[PDB]
Design a protein around this ligand. Structure first.
Ligand SMILES: Nc1nc2c(ncn2[C@@H]2O[C@H](CO)[C@@H](O)[C@H]2OP(=O)(O)O)c(=O)[nH]1
Ligand code: NA
Ligand code: NA
Length: 103
């Protein structure tokens, strides 16, 4: 696994595919789903991302398909304004409504 979010296993191609879809919607000024993804990720957790902000979060799904407006699940891809990958985060293993980084 390139990224492990709890029990979910993601390759760098699964991440690139998810990011490309979130980035396109972001540029278009449109969102999908009841929680309106993609949307800004503030970095309250204080992850040390090596690319610049602003950051946006978009769901990445364990099933392998691109998020298509249903349940976002626990996992997210985080990307910035230049379509650079910041990281992959999850609610799995985090307390409250915080996130932890996938490893
Ligand atoms: N845990 C977490 N939630 C965030 C972050 N950025 C935005 N959100 C949350 O995502 C949702 C969409 O904006 C809001 O509930 C917002 O929470 P706050 O209301 O606390 O800002 C972040 O860095 N961490
Ligand atoms: Na809009
Ligand atoms: Na809890």
């Amino acid at each position: 696994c390139d990224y492990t979010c709890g029990s979910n296993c993601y390759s760098s191609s699964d991440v690139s595919t998810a990011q490309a879809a979130g980035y396109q919607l972001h540029e278009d000024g449109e969102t999908v789903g009841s929680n309106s993804y993609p949307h800004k990720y503030n970095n309250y957790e204080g992850f040390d991302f090596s690319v610049s902000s602003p950051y946006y979060e978009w769901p990445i799904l364990s099933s392998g398909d691109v998020y298509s407006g249903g349940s976002p699940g626990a996992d997210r891809v985080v990307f910035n304004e230049n379509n650079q990958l910041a990281g992959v985060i999850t609610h799995t293993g985090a307390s409250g409504n915080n996130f932890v980084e996938c490893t």
